[model samples]
Target: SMNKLYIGNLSENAAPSDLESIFKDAKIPVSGPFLVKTGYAFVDCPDESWALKAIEALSGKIELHGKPIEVEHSVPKRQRIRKLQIRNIPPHLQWEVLDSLLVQYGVVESCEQVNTDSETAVVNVTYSSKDQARQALDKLNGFQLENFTLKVAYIPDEMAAQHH
Candidate 1:
């Protein structure tokens, strides 16, 4: 099977050829044409090495119209449920402060800041377990911090493409 690359948090105005243009210029190899969705897109990598290179060389390095695109090794739904999207994060809040709030509930496996062209922050935090994510979501969602309401929820496991 080919390594699947997940391109998330894409601007609504993004097009398939727009992504293709970046890959074409970056010299990053994609197996086929990008499957562009409403707010995200997907493409297959030639191999794991190329996939890794594309992610490292592409994410946060280029902008699609206005917003920077996200690049990651797309895993299956069963593997990504622990991830939580914390949106509308205040601009003044430091990463350290957010880390402290997250760790207050349970062990966090990963925390990544999604690229945005806005003032508010967008972060994806993964907990050690699915239940922990649920707990965090309940506790943090609609919770106000420094006058900004934090929007927290599980990043639902929904990849529009069907793998058959």
Candidate 2:
């Protein structure tokens, strides 16, 4: 309900007081560091200015229990989902085959063949959430997809915007 910042890549057992103390020490006024089902939290700030400052001060720079935290401005649920570009796919791989391969990681909202003229084909895959895309990238990037090694990356927001 207030300006929120996402604090991610936290320890599964991390407590709100842990985050609260960190913010308090940094002199950043914040409300509930509401922990989510996943290992992340939403920290509500007094206003947008405070949220921006919190993100700048804590994002990728603050260590909690030895792990650096990931911080970013929170967006609506729909906007939080992400798209990934999968390149170096074998030209012989059918849509169903590719779909099955991708779904092994998470739900693939959609998969579109982008190109097939190169030595290897390319496809753009949309995942239901940023987390899923991240998981797939970590687990599958550089792994084999038929005869070619896979290349995967998040489609930059600027390029994704042009599609809509």
Candidate 3:
């Protein structure tokens, strides 16, 4: 519960053993040093006191690959759906060009054009991260696509799944 901590700014070389060793040296009994991808991790202590001790002893003071590790109370992660709606694509544009344009923003998980009127196309794209989708929406929205300007927006799941 309160013993859970979020450890951030980890490098790819940071291993669980390093965290365990740090905790051991601090005389803090910890349960997990679970790795959360290359840049982050979670560690569990036995109680709030232990958690505070870990934070005071380690946060901003320990270096993992020369970067200071950030420690904080673990919070529930929000489910991130990385999807966007792109509209006003001129019908003659090639899928390759569209895909390339989107991929320049980030790795696209999927891109599918909706079967709508042939005059203009509506496509929904999903990215590997919500940050990518947001960046595309900010920079690529109202972008010139041949004769038409593109409209990019974060499409909710309900609207993203349907042809609009």
Clash number by candidate, in order: 0, 0, 0
Q: Pick the candidate with the highest lDDT.
A: 1
lDDT of each: 0.78, 0.70, 0.74
Off by over 4 Å in 1: 81-164
- Candidate 3 overall Cα lDDT vs. reference? 0.74
Candidates 2 and 3 compared by lDDT, better number: 3
Q: Lowest-scoring 10 consecutive residues by lDDT in candidate 1? A: 155-164
lDDT of 1 by residue, 1-164 (tens): 32688898799889998999899898977888899999899999887557656765787678887888888667665654577777779998988999989998889988987765457887878777777777898999899998998877555444322322
Cα displacement (Å) at residue 80, model 3: 7.5
What is the TM-score ranking, best to worst? 1, 2, 3
RMSD of each candidate?
8.6, 11.9, 16.3
Tens digits of per-residue lDDT for model 3 on 8-114? 98888888888787778879898765666678898788876677567657877888779999776574533224777676788888899898888888998889866
Segments of candidate 3 deviating more than 4 angstroms: 1-80, 157-164
Instruction: For candidate 3, list the clashing residue pairs, or say none.
Output: none
